[PDB]
Design a protein around this ligand. Structure first.
Ligand SMILES: *[C@@H]1O[C@H](CO)[C@@H](O)[C@H](O)[C@H]1NC(C)=O
Ligand SMILES: *[C@@H]1O[C@H](CO)[C@@H](O)[C@H](O)[C@H]1NC(C)=O
Ligand SMILES: *[C@@H]1O[C@H](CO)[C@@H](O)[C@H](O)[C@H]1NC(C)=O
Ligand SMILES: [Cl-]
Length: 512
């Protein structure tokens, strides 16, 4: 029953809640992030999640073709989701590549980031333990910034392609290809492990984090807000994307997950449970990582807002620092990186299988099992690897950060979600959906969610977008570097490559 549904949904938590949420909550202050986080959650997250589940269940088609009989004129939501999930597959596998590199470098007796007496460290390096005794730098951040991937002075100098990371990325892609070769999703007792290990790892990390000194400052920074920061659109614009990324909203996956359920199945309670559980695990992981970050700041004796990198690498700077202090660091490090690989992989298979099925639905005659689908999967993996080689070279962090900020976040996700809510609440109508639910499942849901879809989400999205446009600021990596105009143009081209799908399909349909 409930144990079975939690066993099925154990794959809900992924690299999102464990990695992306911390650095998004850290880039622009922690306390000023929770208020728009929860506002956007209860305004759009659970509403749009439930909406995707209902559309996938009511209509047997799940994905691109769900909108074919709801509103054909707005069919571009599926294409936008396909483009967004393709870019997501492009830049998501790099996190797994870094995790694999750490796993391979963690088999040694002494962890590489324990000390910085190595051949890739400047003399200015100092051990953070002895730091309290404007040019010093902790060993972990220096290691992550040079040995893991060397940083050029800017994006204008791509440098030379790295080889060890390329090999790790190729290994991960080959593992994914050879696992989709057969398919190991159908599991018996293994689903118990695949659902218990991540939670146990997170729980022991939580215990370690809040049992460490200096966690109080991290908790206060995470919770206590700053009203003045709400005056900048960055906090709202990234709080309206982190919660959408966590639930895989608008990625075309949740609109097809509900297609497996039958007509008479109470999906309301399941959707509420998964949403609340995802929010809770994200919140507790935030406590853990901000506690370890506060401990890092306490030993480093520097301001919390700049103690660590304010970019995609926050997890790889906090979590290894946490497992370093745990007894027998090698064992816990190996287990943790296996956990990261398991979660990120499972997300990678769902993101990929969804994309492949969605694109095959476009041309069903081209690929009907056999070997043509096999070579198509091989081609997709090869092209994704080649494209991902761009952000793994020397100074590859800038391309990755820009592509993450402008690919599956920022304005594209809010754009897709706003049109989704607008069409569902202004052509199909919330009353019609409640009538269908009432005649479909037991109990009539409260009128809260129809008002939600009608007002709370579209107003929030439009206001955030316009408020960002008026107070336009360039995207900056970390806090001391500024992109050139052409880099921002490239990022905006990336975002438009997703956003323009809806107007393009609209005008094509209006032509005939
Ligand atoms: C050299 O590396 C060892 C290994 O951790 C370390 O204990 C020692 O402090 C380092 N010495 C210098 C001068 O970096
Ligand atoms: C600072 O360095 C000196 C020199 O080794 C050492 O004696 C002292 O214990 C250090 N201070 C702390 C707080 O460890
Ligand atoms: C250290 O940082 C300061 C700025 O705070 C800078 O003026 C100085 O050149 C840097 N290097 C050294 C060796 O002090
Ligand atoms: Cl989240």
């Amino acid at each position: 029953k409930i144990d079975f549904v939690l066993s099925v949904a154990g794959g809900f938590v992924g690299l999102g809640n464990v990695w992306r949420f911390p650095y998004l909550c850290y880039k622009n202050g922690g306390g000023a992030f929770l208020i728009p986080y929860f506002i956007f959650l209860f305004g759009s997250g659970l509403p749009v999640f439930f909406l995707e589940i209902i559309i996938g269940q009511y209509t047997s088609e799940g994905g691109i073709t769900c909108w074919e009989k709801i509103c054909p004129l707005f069919s571009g939501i599926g294409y936008a989701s396909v483009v967004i999930v393709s870019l997501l597959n492009v830049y998501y596998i790099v996190i797994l590549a870094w995790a694999t590199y750490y796993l391979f470098q963690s088999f040694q007796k002494e962890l590489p980031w324990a000390h910085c007496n190595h051949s890739w460290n400047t003399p200015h390096c100092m051990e953070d333990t002895m730091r309290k005794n404007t040019n010093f730098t902790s060993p972990v951040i220096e290691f992550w910034e040079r040995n893991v991937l060397s940083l050029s002075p800017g994006i204008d100098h791509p440098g030379s392609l790295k080889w060890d990371l390329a090999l790790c990325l190729l290994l991960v892609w080959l593992v994914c290809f050879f696992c989709i070769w057969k398919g190991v999703r159908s599991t018996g007792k293994v689903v118990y492990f695949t659902a218990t290990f991540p939670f146990a790892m997170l729980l022991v990390l939580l215990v370690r984090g809040l049992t460490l000194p200096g966690a109080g400052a991290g908790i206060k920074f995470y919770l206590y807000p700053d009203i003045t920061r709400l005056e900048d659109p960055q906090v709202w614009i990234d709080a309206g994307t982190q919660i959408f990324f966590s639930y895989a909203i608008c990625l075309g996956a949740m609109t097809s997950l509900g297609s497996y359920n039958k007509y008479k199945y109470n999906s309301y309670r399941d959707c509420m449970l998964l949403g609340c559980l995802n929010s809770g695990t994200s919140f507790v992981s935030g406590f853990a990582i901000f506690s370890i970050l506060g401990f890092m700041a306490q030993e480093q004796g520097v301001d919390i807002a700049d103690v660590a990198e304010s970019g995609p690498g926050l997890a790889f700077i906090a979590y290894p620092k946490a497992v370093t202090m745990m007894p027998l660091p090698t064992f816990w490090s190996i287990l943790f990186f296996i956990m990261l690989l398991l979660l990120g992989l499972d997300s990678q298979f769902v993101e990929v299988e969804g994309q492949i099925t969605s694109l095959v639905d476009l041309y069903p005659s081209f690929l009907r099992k056999g070997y043509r689908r096999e070579i198509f999967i091989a081609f997709v993996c090869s092209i994704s690897y080649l494209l991902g080689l761009t952000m793994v070279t020397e100074g590859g962090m800038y391309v990755f950060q820009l592509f993450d900020y402008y690919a599956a976040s920022g304005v594209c996700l809010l754009w897709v979600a706003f049109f989704e809510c607008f069409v569902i609440a202004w052509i199909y109508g919330g009353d019609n959906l409640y009538d269908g639910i009432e005649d479909m499942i037991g109990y009539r849901p409260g009128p809260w969610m129809k008002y939600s879809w009608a007002v709370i989400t579209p107003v929030l999205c439009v206001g955030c977008f316009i408020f960002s446009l008026v107070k336009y600021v360039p995207l900056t990596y970390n806090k001391t570097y500024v992109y050139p105009n052409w880099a921002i143009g490239l990022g905006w081209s990336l975002a438009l490559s997703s956003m323009l799908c809806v107007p393009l399909v609209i005008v094509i349909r209006l032509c005939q």
